[PDB]
Design goal:
part of a larger assembly, 4 chains, A mainly beta (about 35), B alpha/beta (about 350), C mainly alpha (about 300), D little secondary structure (about 40), C: about 300 residues, mainly alpha, three-stranded antiparallel beta sheet, 11 helices, 6 strands, about 5% strand, D: about 40 residues, little secondary structure, rod-shaped, binds zinc ion, General transcription and DNA repair factor IIH subunit TFB1 (chain A), Transcription initiation factor IIE subunit beta (chain D), zinc (chain C), metal-binding (chain C), transcription regulation (chain C)
Chain lengths: ~35, ~350, ~300, ~40
């Protein structure tokens, strides 16, 4: 899993799977929910 | 100290320095300063003159004289005369001086109150058990021949720059870095300090160094683990803030000064590992054999052996034969070092210029 | 989620269904469902006109029911039109509702007070009011009729004052219908209301459509002054291994705290420094078997 | 809010925002430049 900090303007989550690895690429609109 | 270990509100406390000159509005409080301002015979500023006049005109009941060994000096002897105080307290760690004027402290402060038993404090875990050792460094023939033909001022730099002491210091650094010991290497000669920093590759601090650089080196010593050896000049001998260390290497010193030995040894007396069982602090004094280092170090260790410490001699180090890095092993490099030491000693016209 | 949030949603729904028209109910329910909404979101969800939402948004802003946020963001096409976000300020909304209902009932009480006096006298030719206090000096010497100063016309009695019971019945019919409002504010005033804003309303948003032109992420500006749990399972065999590790850090700590060889020993005596049972157990098991037979877009990342 | 308490009706709102609210110097260790790390905190 890959996350963004509070200093980032665009906040974004990355999920990398295991065996080509699958990538899921998620945008949440609130900091607390994220 | 006055803010944390005692219940003193900051309005009773004032600082009389160059940067800080405010003075307390209460009828009685605390002012902390250095001997240099009050005893200054030069022309002082108007604010400092007002502070000095207030100190002279206000009757003080008690004075704390930290590091009382500088009191019997030339102008500091007057700090008990310009300031009127009933009770005078002298607190220091080095009650020794080379001149007889140290024996005049009884005329300045009073009778000697209490002498601390250093073995009693060390065996109870209050201070670290320092292992006072003296590593002997023999002379090469050409260096010692050059030592016998020159004056004493060049002789000092000549016996400091012996390659045997370089090898011994490098081996001691290599040995004590593997053990996780924090190492401070003291040497008063600034050119010696620079040569050691160039040859070994460790940070060096002297008097005219930038202060931000000094703090950066200090926190790199305290926190960063790939720097465990710091080289310092006489600045670290005085009462300045230094990080905690367990190993000290004394390369050179300002002649036979007994005060400087205890001043340097008190840096490692406040080690963090004092609560650990079997911990022994390390204090090595690198000396050049058959030279005036022997005389000066024997004079210097007199106060420490009077306190009780035993300086064990070390003439052989196991690891010189199979050392990885050999400093000045080749004879030509030793000679090159030898001649290096010998060679050491109108608003419009303004644009036209 | 919060029962108090459901309660204040019921407050807003009931007041807009009672004192406002159907389109106001539609926009207020749209804002209550999806917490933060822009103008294009309303125009997509409700198929509403700008001229149709004009009076609605104006009335709901004048009554402090819908809060407007004037944030503009930076889309990838950079066409930063000044989108307005419609959300709800729950303490402001409940304060506005309470103030409005209190002012309505106080104005009705004042109307009842001004209806409590006697009727008075009207002049219909000049259409002029006359109270009982000021009609005293307009009588004739005949002592028969109230004569006006201007029209010199026989005055007639007002029908006001006799409508006192009608206004009382109006108060009765208002008060029992507003009883759910009072009962709900009894629970609201006994509870704690958090002050929400656009950032707070962003935490509970519902997406209105798939592709929203307005970005809901807040863009701050400079100069605006307006953990893990891991377990170790050992099958009663590796305890000796952990004790071997423990004694190994013990012995390396004692080695690193040991005195050096030149300290514990004098170095002056040396030179100066310078430059098979498997078949057995198988036959055993065979014997026991025989015996038993016998007896039986990319950004920067951190790993979290 | 400051008159709702005067009218006896207890407000359920906090007071809104309209109510008053709150060098570089020389380096001498030039032969080891870049190996020292900055430490701005303990
Ligand atoms: Zn009329």
């Amino acid at each position: 899993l890959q996350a963004t900090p509070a200093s980032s303007e665009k906040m974004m989550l990355r999920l990398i799977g295991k065996v080509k690895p699958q990538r899921h690429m998620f945008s949440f609109n609130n900091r607390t929910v994220m | 100290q006055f803010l944390q270990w005692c219940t003193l509100q900051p309005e009773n406390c004032a600082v009389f320095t160059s940067d800080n000159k405010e003075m307390f509005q209460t009828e009685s409080g605390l002012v902390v300063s250095t001997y240099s301002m009050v005893a200054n015979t030069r022309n002082r500023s108007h604010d400092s003159q007002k502070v000095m006049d207030f100190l002279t005109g206000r009757e003080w009941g008690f004075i704390i004289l930290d590091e009382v060994h500088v009191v019997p000096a030339a102008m500091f002897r007057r700090v008990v005369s310009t300031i009127a105080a009933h009770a005078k307290l002298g607190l220091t760690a080095t009650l020794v001086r080379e001149d007889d004027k140290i024996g005049d402290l009884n005329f300045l402060i009073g009778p000697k109150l209490y002498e601390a038993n250093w073995m009693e404090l060390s065996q109870k875990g209050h201070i670290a058990n320092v292992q006072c050792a003296e590593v002997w460094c023999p002379m090469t023939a050409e260096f010692y021949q050059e030592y016998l033909r020159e004056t004493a001022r060049k002789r000092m730099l000549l016996y400091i720059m012996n390659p045997t002491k370089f090898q011994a210091c490098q081996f001691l650094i290599q040995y004590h870095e593997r053990r996780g010991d924090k190492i401070i290497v003291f040497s008063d000669n600034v050119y010696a300090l620079q040569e050691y920093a160039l040859k070994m590759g460790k940070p060096f601090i002297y008097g005219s160094t930038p202060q931000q650089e000094r703090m950066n080196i200090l926190q790199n010593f305290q926190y960063n683990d790939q720097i465990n050896t710091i080289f310092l000049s006489k600045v670290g001998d005085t009462s300045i803030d230094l990080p905690e260390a367990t190993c000290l290497i004394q390369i050179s010193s300002h002649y036979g000064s007994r005060r400087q030995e205890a001043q340097r040894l008190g840096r490692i007396l406040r080690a963090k590992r004092r609560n650990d069982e079997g911990f022994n602090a390390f204090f090595y004094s690198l000396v050049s054999k058959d030279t005036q280092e022997m005389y000066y170090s024997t004079k210097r260790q007199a106060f420490l052996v009077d306190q009780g410490y035993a300086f064990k001699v070390i003439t052989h180090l196991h690891g010189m034969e199979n050392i990885p890095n050999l400093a000045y092993a080749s004879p030509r490099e030793r000679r090159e070092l030898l001649q290096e030491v010998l060679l050491k000693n109108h608003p419009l016209i303004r644009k036209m210029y | 989620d919060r029962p108090i949030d459901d309660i204040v949603k019921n407050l807003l729904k009931f007041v807009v269904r009672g004192f406002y028209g159907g389109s106001f109910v539609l926009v207020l329910d749209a804002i209550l469902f999806h917490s933060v909404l822009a103008e294009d979101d309303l125009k997509q969800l409700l198929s509403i006109n700008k001229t149709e939402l004009g009076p609605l948004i104006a009335r709901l802003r004048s009554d402090r029911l819908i809060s407007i946020h004037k944030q503009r963001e930076y889309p990838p096409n950079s066409k930063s039109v000044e989108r307005v976000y419609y959300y709800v300020k729950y303490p402001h909304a409940i304060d506005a509702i309470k103030w409005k209902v209190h002012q309505v009932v106080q104005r009705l009480k004042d109307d009842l007070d001004k209806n409590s006096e006697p009727n008075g006298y009207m002049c219909p030719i000049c259409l002029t009011k006359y109270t009982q206090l000021e009609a005293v000096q307009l009588l004739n010497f005949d002592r028969t009729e109230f004569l006006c100063s201007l029209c010199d016309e026989p005055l007639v009695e007002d029908d006001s004052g006799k409508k006192n019971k009608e206004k009382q019945d109006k108060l009765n019919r208002l008060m029992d219908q507003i009883q759910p409002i009072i009962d709900s504010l009894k629970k609201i005033d006994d509870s704690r209301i958090e002050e929400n804003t656009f950032e707070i309303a962003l935490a509970r948003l519902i997406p209105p459509q798939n592709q929203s032109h307005a970005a809901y992420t807040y863009n701050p500006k400079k100069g605006s002054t307006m953990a893990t749990l891991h377990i170790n399972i050992t099958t009663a065999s590796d305890e000796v291994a952990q004790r071997e590790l423990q004694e190994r850090q013990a012995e390396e700590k004692r080695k690193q705290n040991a005195v050096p060889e030149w300290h514990k020993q004098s170095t002056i005596g040396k030179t100066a420094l310078g430059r098979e049972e498997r078949e057995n157990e198988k036959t055993l098991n065979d014997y026991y078997a025989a015996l038993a037979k016998k007896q039986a877009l990319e950004d920067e990342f951190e790993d979290v | 809010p400051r008159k709702l308490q005067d009218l006896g009706l207890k407000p359920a709102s906090v007071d809104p925002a309209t109510i008053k609210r709150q060098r570089k110097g020389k380096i001498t260790n030039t032969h080891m430049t870049g190996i020292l790390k900055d430490y701005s905190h303990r």
